[PDB]
Design a protein around this ligand. Structure first.
Ligand SMILES: [Cu+2]
Ligand SMILES: [Cu+2]
Ligand SMILES: [Zn+2]
Ligand SMILES: [Zn+2]
Lengths: 153, 153
């Protein structure tokens, strides 16, 4: 039973705790928790390559993309490993997160431990948008909060 | 080849950036950087087991100790994998960190990526303090600052 956790913090009001659980080697990873201080609507939700917060969320670099694919949504064959789609915040500015993903892992070459979880300014268009930036970043804009994914008890 | 980084944060502000570099997976790890906001003198400096900062540095748990050994200094055969001894702060409260260690790793069973680096209130006695706590924590007292160790570019 592998477990991981991530504390999301930024320069503004966005703060979250996100938990990961993977029962089996090469089984699905359950992703859950809560993020507050968000604007109502969709916020892009990604694993970025580097667990580097030296200069804040910008230091995490691009989407975690070990297989050199284009950007997409979690349900797409063509996605980055780190493509976890959107979280949705209500009028209270809270996003309840309950995700299962079979592309991320907590071990092996898809391992996300020691990488950065990022929640974004805008919606991720899941690569289905009307421009080139769709198929690199999903046009989710700035990084509102982030943290390094750590091994949990 | 293998690089890692950690941002230390805590009340003071106690603020640090610590870099890790391991050319070879069978090779030593160079650990360098700077921590400010410390009291002049020795501060214990350890890798703790969990990369969990959900409730602060307390969430990181005990020293990283995959081989079930007693606490020691970095030069000791009998040590926790996480035992990196002390950093030393100047009268300006700055600890310049320059450490080479052959027991921590950035891959394999002694991998410290996704675990928590902690700088402590007091000196680590490197397990030579006599009392029972010396053999467990080095009597280094509270956790002033910590962060999760992430993979770096
Ligand atoms: Cu992202
Ligand atoms: Cu410690
Ligand atoms: Zn992507
Ligand atoms: Zn120890």
């Amino acid at each position: 039973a592998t477990k991981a956790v991530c504390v999301l913090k930024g320069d503004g009001p966005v703060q979250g705790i996100i938990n990961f659980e993977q029962k089996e080697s090469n089984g699905p990873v359950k992703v859950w928790g809560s993020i507050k201080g968000l604007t109502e609507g969709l916020h892009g939700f990604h694993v970025h390559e580097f667990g580097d917060n030296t200069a804040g969320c910008t230091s995490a670099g691009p989407h975690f993309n070990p297989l050199s694919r284009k950007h997409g949504g979690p349900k797409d064959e063509e996605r980055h490993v780190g493509d976890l789609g959107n979280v949705t915040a209500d009028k209270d500015g809270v996003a309840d997160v309950s995700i299962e993903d079979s592309v991320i892992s907590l071990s092996g070459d898809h391992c996300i431990i020691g990488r950065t979880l990022v929640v974004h300014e805008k919606a991720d268009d899941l690569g289905k948008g009307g421009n080139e930036e769709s198929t690199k970043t999903g046009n989710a804009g700035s990084r509102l909060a982030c943290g390094v994914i750590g091994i949990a008890q």
